[PDB]
Write a protein that holds these residues in place. Structure first.
Motif, PDB file in Angstrom:
ATOM      1  N   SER A 144       1.166  -1.427   0.311  1.00  0.00           N
ATOM      2  CA  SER A 144       0.168  -0.106  -0.103  1.00  0.00           C
ATOM      3  C   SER A 144       0.638   0.978   0.222  1.00  0.00           C
ATOM      4  O   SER A 144       0.860   2.220  -1.188  1.00  0.00           O
ATOM      5  N   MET A 145       1.363   1.494   1.000  1.00  0.00           N
ATOM      6  CA  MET A 145       2.494   2.335   0.925  1.00  0.00           C
ATOM      7  C   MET A 145       3.812   2.824   0.116  1.00  0.00           C
ATOM      8  O   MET A 145       3.654   4.022  -0.477  1.00  0.00           O
ATOM      9  N   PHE A 146       4.303   1.596   0.645  1.00  0.00           N
ATOM     10  CA  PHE A 146       5.484   1.956  -0.933  1.00  0.00           C
ATOM     11  C   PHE A 146       4.820   2.375  -1.831  1.00  0.00           C
ATOM     12  O   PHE A 146       5.488   1.940  -2.772  1.00  0.00           O
ATOM     13  N   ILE A 147       3.432   1.893  -2.442  1.00  0.00           N
ATOM     14  CA  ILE A 147       2.984   2.426  -3.782  1.00  0.00           C
ATOM     15  C   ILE A 147       2.302   3.561  -4.060  1.00  0.00           C
ATOM     16  O   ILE A 147       2.826   4.244  -5.090  1.00  0.00           O
TER      17      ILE A 147
END
Ligand SMILES: CCCCCCCCCCCCCC(=O)SCCNC(=O)CCNC(=O)[C@@H](O)C(C)(C)COP(=O)(O)O
Ligand code: SF4
Lengths: 112, 98, 173, 309, 173, 52, 106, 156, 83, 52
Positions: free
Chosen positions: D69-72
């Motif tokens: 989620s965050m990494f993207i």
């Protein structure tokens, strides 16, 4: 002759036991640290096997140096100076077992 | 009141509820506290703009500054607590009783 | 697009539920960035350009970035989303449901009254018909702080300086 | 037609970044007595395309992200903010004309910082977080000095409207009036984009496409910041009937500033974190405060307060 | 056998290993929603064989002078219930056990209809064919080598930190 | 003397506050990092390991 | 609606590129690197946080300094100038306090 | 056929991109690293060919083993190699990397990096001249040009 | 619930039971490890370490050598805990 | 060390880098990570001679 650390064999055996305790307690952590596939028993079995390999020594000087070398290997293992392969090198795996029966050796090759 | 005012006030209420009902991390409580400050900023801004309270358009900015000051304080306390205990868990604050 | 402000306010409430569910700090911080961005949108819709950019530049830009800074350096948590373990998931869902009930009681019933009286009419009505000419009411009033609000400037500045002092004294060990 | 304008602002910038990669390679090489990419296409004109195609075909490795989620989201935020920052810029006429465009730019740069934090935290890598936090610290100090300098220079503009800068610098470039602020501003822009000597060599976990997009966003930010410097200090003549003249002059100025960015990159050794912050806190900040005092007092004492409207 | 009369035919059963399509396939049920198991895989008992055991048997068969012309059948050490086996797989892989078209894929199909049938088909038991013990290779239990194949499929904190030890799954023997 | 005047069964085990307002240091876990200068690092020239 | 359109287009374009860079390139089959993320187990130094809190406070003071361009149009120029110089002097004083005392350690 | 024509042309495009923008990692171990630097030196300038020295092995395509791979360094080489993304190619520079060279009979020297990692191009010499190393890279580029990964997938 | 000599003995014997090498039939309170149970010196060291784990203290090598019978271990633990 | 034959009996090689790298820790005390890189450069450490 100047003793390396222990003047008598009893003193040397004390050092051997101290090293064995450290190795025995380190084995569980070592399996965790290097994510080894050996069991804690397997590592502790190997430790005992390695200690029992040099069980015929009678000179306290030689026993002292063996303990020193044993300490050095433990230091590298604890400090993660060794790598996963280095720890696994104790457990000879890929090496094919060489038979001991004379008839088997006779078939295998010219091995004396 | 217009529905937007209702929504902002409800946001303040929700953030207050979250702040009062801690879970584990004191960081989460601080987040809820700052959220409430944001909601108050939005509410006061809308009120001042609609009333054309020209001289009071500076109130939200002052609120924002003081809000972030009290936050700088909260964070400083949180890191002191975490450095002492190891985590920012609210349960760690248990030495003082009653 | 006549109810854009209402949609934004609902999304604001949703984000407030999201971060008020006390999730993993990283996910919460986002729940606040999203809500903060929405609130800026609402303020812009009412015409507070300077104040809208204020929260974006200071609250979202600096206040929440230093908050994230701390969460990153002191990271002792198992990451989880708003729809993770029931403690957070149930809270998020229940908050959304309460908000939706308020919305339905607000639109279908014009005079909704829970603790204050609310009118279901679009917020566009409250806007006042007036001309400022070559003026930025918000900007002019806020700039008047240096002229009219000398006392406010003095007190706020002293508070800031003493805040720096206090922060150092607290974080000296 | 407005969507056509948005596309004609987005696509050319991306292509310009792609060719800026080649331009940087060749410039650095020729400053090192080397020929930049010269085999892949005539004068290396096909080098960026080759790089892009290779990247989008390389096996992407997964970096055990604690939160895909965050990494993207981090790449998306970086690229979107980089694209958005170009919108308010007046090439004589801006796409979106904001009365407070300058503050909008500053806020957009401030949000961009989150991409760094999110990338490192979600990366699940101690070294990643350490490096990310170092980037946070670096961008932290630049923002203060950048804001102070921008405010001080706009004290003669009369507002935060970007378009008004053209009128203010109609007769004389702003740099001739505020050259020390110009120096500190350029160095602060270098610090913002982590361009050398403010790099921290040795978000690396990003693989191929993700990395490529982060790289594109960073270089687009480089070009945008140089454009901002151009508009702020290196004013350009604008004929209302023929805006192409201003467009050409402005583009040339931005290109010159990016070339200076590369020229500095291959001229000086990299700083140290302590040295970088002992610059942006103990050399620039006091001077910026003093110059802000001066640029507040000067218009009043010289009766040169710019028009509000 | 018709063309090569003395051919040594080997019949392995669901070879498992690091790059195997049997253990890793089950641990890849995440793509396929939960754990798609025909009838919860309650009527299927499979006997998996270790990769090295099969390979060593093949080499031993080449050396073995009597292996020529004999149809060997490489069986696993224990027979596991498909449901228990998958439960054990997800267990050591730190994967939530959620007990619950791909042929169309032009690139290597994720799932085959025949593969689905073969997965839910309980392994046969032929006691009239020579096995690993005939070639001298001693069968290695799946438990010992399970982690080597599935630890790499860990999610967040099971290859370290918690590192909970999953006991051997029940074998239908 | 004691934590509370009328103690309960649970409070009986509870220890009175320390004489000084100084609660004992707990764990005292070292924060000293042990970084390794991986050989691939340019400065290591590919053949240098610096346990630091 | 124009600015909203710009934001939407930029965000959608970036997200689409992220799609074609995160899921499209991983479709190509590249065997399988059976390589586990071998992990076997905290530098919360004030050296970082201090840089953060001080930035927060200086950013707050910068926020108070933003309305200055419009404040120059006031008739009470002397008072506005004095207040602006006061805010700047307080910023400098805060910096000096940290510099003179144990601060700016970064 | 048309399908073959499309696949072949696409495969050529993919081959061109990789061979044109090869990104090598400098696994400089011994004397051969110095000549590798002279390849990147202005006279030869590997970057002119698109081959830019990528410090990050995670963003590299070619591992140039330049030097004597000792037993102590051997595990690191393989571990770095498997952490490289694919497609990954290994170029062995120098007799020491090829088969141990001067130290073939040493007690702590791997008898060629081929044992530890699969090698694609062997550059002979001690040290191989920078042109010879550049020649090897160009040979690797031609090797990539001949690759038909897509064609085989279509004809499978 | 203060530690009792009987409880100390119970935990000692429990640890000895956990030790697979020790034969339960030959296990006794006074059964000498090296003679009655016929264990090696390393086995005795392992047993001492297991006792240290069970009772959460540390036995120096000298005292470990002294402990040659389970009853002796019980008495040593009695002195250690002053029971 | 020559034994009178055509092959040396013992050839110890004194590498200047060997001693310099041994003193790296002493020089690196009270420095940052980036300083270590500089200290390596100023000692001109080639691991070929250091490891002989
Ligand atoms: C992963 C597993 C790593 C295992 C590493 C274990 C090692 O460090 S091997 C070195 C151990 N060598 C020794 O302890 C030398 C002992 N030398 C002796 O002579 C002993 O057998 C004594 C002194 C006769 C004592 O023998 P007993 O223990 O009474 O019979
Ligand atoms: S091949 Fe020659 S130059 Fe290269 S590392 Fe070996 S000895 Fe040195």
């Amino acid at each position: 002759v100047k003793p390396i650390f222990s003047r008598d064999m009893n003193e040397a055996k004390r050092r051997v036991r101290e090293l064995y305790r450290a190795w025995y307690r380190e084995v569980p952590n070592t399996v965790h640290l290097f994510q080894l596939d050996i069991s804690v028993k397997q590592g502790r079995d190997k430790v005992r096997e390695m200690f029992m390999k040099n069980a015929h020594v009678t000179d306290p000087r030689v026993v002292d140096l063996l303990v020193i070398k044993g300490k050095m290997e433990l230091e590298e293992t604890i400090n993660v100076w060794k790598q996963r392969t280095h720890i696994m090198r104790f457990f000879h795996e890929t090496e094919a077992p060489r038979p001991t029966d004379f008839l088997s050796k006779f078939y295998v090759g010219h091995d004396p | 009141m217009p529905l937007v005012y209702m929504n902002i006030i409800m946001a303040f209420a929700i953030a207050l509820a979250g702040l009062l009902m801690y879970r584990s991390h004191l960081m989460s409580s601080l987040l809820c506290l700052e959220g409430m400050m944001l909601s108050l900023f939005i509410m006061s801004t809308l009120i001042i703009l609609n009333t054309h309270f020209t001289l009071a358009n500076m109130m939200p900015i002052i609120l924002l500054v003081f809000a972030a000051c009290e936050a700088a304080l909260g964070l400083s306390l949180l890191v002191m607590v975490s450095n002492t205990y190891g985590t920012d868990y609210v349960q760690n604050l248990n030495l003082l009783q009653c | 697009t006549m109810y854009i402000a209402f949609i934004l306010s609902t999304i604001f409430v949703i984000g407030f539920v999201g971060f008020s569910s006390k999730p993993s700090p990283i996910y919460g911080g986002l729940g606040l960035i999203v809500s903060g961005g929405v609130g800026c949108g609402i303020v812009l819709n009412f015409g507070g350009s300077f104040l809208g950019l204020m929260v974006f530049l200071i609250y979202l830009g600096g206040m929440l970035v230093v908050f994230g800074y701390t969460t990153a350096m002191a990271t002792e948590m198992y990451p989880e989303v708003w729809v993770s373990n029931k403690t957070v998931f149930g809270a998020f869902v229940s908050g959304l449901m309460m908000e939706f009930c308020m919305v339905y009681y607000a639109l279908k019933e014009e005079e909704v009254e829970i603790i204050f009286k609310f009118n279901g009419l679009g917020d566009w009505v409250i806007y006042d018909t007036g001309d400022s000419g070559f003026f930025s009411e918000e900007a002019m009033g806020i700039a008047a702080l240096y002229s009219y609000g000398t006392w406010l400037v003095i007190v706020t500045g002293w508070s800031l300086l003493i805040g720096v002092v206090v922060i150092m004294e607290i974080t000296r060990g | 037609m407005f969507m056509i304008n948005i596309l004609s602002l987005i696509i050319p910038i991306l292509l310009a970044v792609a060719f800026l990669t080649l331009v940087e390679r060749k410039v650095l090489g020729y400053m090192q007595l080397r020929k930049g990419p010269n085999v892949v296409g005539p004068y290396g004109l096909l080098q960026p395309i080759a790089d892009a195609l290779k990247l989008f075909t390389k096996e992407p490795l997964r970096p055990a992200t604690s939160s895909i989620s965050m990494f993207i989201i981090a790449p998306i935020l970086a690229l979107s903010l980089a694209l958005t920052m170009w919108v308010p810029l007046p090439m004589p006429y801006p796409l979106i004309n904001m009365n407070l465009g300058v503050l909008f730019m500053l806020a957009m740069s401030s949000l961009a910082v989150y991409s760094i934090l999110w990338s490192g935290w979600a990366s699940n890598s101690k070294y990643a977080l350490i490096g990310a936090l170092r980037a946070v610290a670096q961008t932290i100090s630049y923002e203060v000095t950048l804001a102070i300098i921008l405010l001080s220079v706009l004290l003669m503009n009369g507002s935060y409207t970007l378009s008004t800068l053209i009128t203010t610098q109609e007769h004389i470039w702003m740099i001739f009036t505020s050259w020390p602020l110009a120096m500190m501003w350029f160095i602060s822009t270098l610090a913002e984009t982590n361009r050398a000597p403010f790099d921290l060599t040795e978000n690396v976990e990003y693989a191929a496409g993700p990395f490529a997009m982060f790289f594109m966003a960073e270089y687009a930010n480089i070009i945008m910041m140089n454009a901002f410097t151009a508009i702020l200090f290196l004013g350009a003549s604008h004929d209302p009937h023929t805006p192409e003249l201003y467009t050409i002059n402005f583009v040339l100025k931005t290109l010159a500033l990016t070339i200076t960015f590369l020229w500095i990159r291959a001229s000086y050794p990299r700083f140290r974190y302590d040295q970088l912050m002992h610059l942006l806190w103990k050399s620039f900040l006091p001077l910026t405060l003093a110059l802000c005092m001066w640029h507040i007092s000067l218009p009043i004492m010289t009766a040169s307060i710019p028009p509000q409207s | 056998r018709a063309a090569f009369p003395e051919a040594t035919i080997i019949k392995p059963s669901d070879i498992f290993g690091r790059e195997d399509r049997f253990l890793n396939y089950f641990a890849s049920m995440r793509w396929f929603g939960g754990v798609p198991l025909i009838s919860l895989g309650k009527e299927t008992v499979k006997q998996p064989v270790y990769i090295v055991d099969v390979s060593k048997g093949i080499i031993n068969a080449i050396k073995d002078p009597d292996a020529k012309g004999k149809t060997f059948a490489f069986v696993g050490p224990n027979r596991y219930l498909l449901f228990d086996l998958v439960q054990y797989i997800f267990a050591v892989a730190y994967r939530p056990f959620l007990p619950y078209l791909f042929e169309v894929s032009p690139f290597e199909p994720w799932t085959t209809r025949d593969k689905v049938e073969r997965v839910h088909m309980s392994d046969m038991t032929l006691p009239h064919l020579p096995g690993l013990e005939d070639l001298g290779i001693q069968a290695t239990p799946l438990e010992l080598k399970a982690i080597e194949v599935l630890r790499r499929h860990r999610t967040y904190r099971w290859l370290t930190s918690e590192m909970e030890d999953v006991k051997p799954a029940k074998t239908v023997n | 003397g004691g934590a509370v005047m009328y103690p309960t069964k649970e409070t009986a085990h509870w220890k009175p506050p320390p004489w000084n307002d100084v609660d004992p240091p707990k764990d005292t876990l070292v924060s000293n990092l042990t970084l390794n200068f991986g050989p691939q690092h340019p400065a290591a020239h590919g053949v240098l390991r610096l346990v630091m | 609606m124009n600015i909203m359109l710009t934001l939407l287009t930029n965000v959608t374009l970036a997200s689409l590129l992220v799609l074609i860079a995160f899921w499209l390139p991983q479709l190509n089959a590249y065997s399988e690197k059976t390589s586990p993320y071998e992990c076997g187990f905290l530098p919360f130094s004030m050296k970082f946080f201090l840089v953060a809190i001080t930035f927060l406070l200086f950013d707050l003071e910068i926020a108070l300094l933003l309305p200055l361009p419009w404040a120059s149009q006031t008739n009470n120029l002397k008072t506005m100038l004095t207040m602006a110089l006061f805010l700047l002097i307080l910023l400098a004083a805060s910096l000096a306090y940290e510099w003179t005392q144990k601060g700016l350690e970064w | 056929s048309r399908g073959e024509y499309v696949v072949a042309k696409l495969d050529d495009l993919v081959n061109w991109a990789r061979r044109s923008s090869l990104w090598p990692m400098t696994f400089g171990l011994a004397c051969c690293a110095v000549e590798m630097m002279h390849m990147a030196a202005p006279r030869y300038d590997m970057d002119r060919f698109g081959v830019v020295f990528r410090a990050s092995p995670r963003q590299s395509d070619v591992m140039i083993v330049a030097g004597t791979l000792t037993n102590k360094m051997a595990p690191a080489l393989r571990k770095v190699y498997d952490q490289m993304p694919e497609p990954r190619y290994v170029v062995s520079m120098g007799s020491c990397a090829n088969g141990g060279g001067y130290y073939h009979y040493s007690y702590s020297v791997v008898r060629g990096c081929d044992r530890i990692v699969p090698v694609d191009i062997y550059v002979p010499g001690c040290p191989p001249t920078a042109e010879a190393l550049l020649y090897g890279i160009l040979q690797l580029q031609r090797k990539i040009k001949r690759e038909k990964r897509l064609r085989i997938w279509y004809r499978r | 619930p203060p530690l009792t000599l009987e409880a100390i003995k119970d935990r000692v014997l429990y640890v000895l039971k956990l030790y697979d090498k020790i034969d339960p039939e030959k296990l006794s309170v006074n059964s000498h490890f090296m003679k009655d149970l016929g264990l090696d010196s390393l086995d005795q060291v392992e047993i001492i370490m297991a006792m240290e784990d069970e009772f959460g203290f540390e036995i120096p090598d000298i005292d470990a050598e002294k402990l040659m019978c389970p009853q002796e271990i019980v008495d040593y633990i009695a002195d250690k805990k002053d029971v | 060390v020559s034994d009178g034959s055509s092959r040396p009996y013992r050839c110890k090689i004194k590498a200047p880098g060997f001693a310099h790298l041994a003193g790296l820790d002493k020089m690196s005390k009270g420095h940052m990570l980036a300083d270590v890189v500089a200290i390596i450069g100023t000692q001109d450490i080639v691991f070929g001679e250091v490891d002989r």
